[PDB]
Amino acid sequence: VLSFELLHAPATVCGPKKSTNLVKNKCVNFNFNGLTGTGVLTKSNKKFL
């Protein structure tokens, strides 16, 4: 038996969140890690952290 409760608290257990192969140099609708927008993706040279 699996029990589920809908309470206002930080959630950390849910599905695998299936992904899709990224497309570079083509205008696509991206959904990276919950963000969403329309644009073209390409390789950058930003020294991230």
Partner: protein, 33 residues
Amino acid sequence: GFSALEPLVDLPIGINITRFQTLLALNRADYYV
């Protein structure tokens, strides 16, 4: 000197916290709050 603090963890504990105490060790100019 100036040194930024980078994040390490983000624990979704979600509990009420009001106190805070630092533990010590044993050995056989610190603790700035």
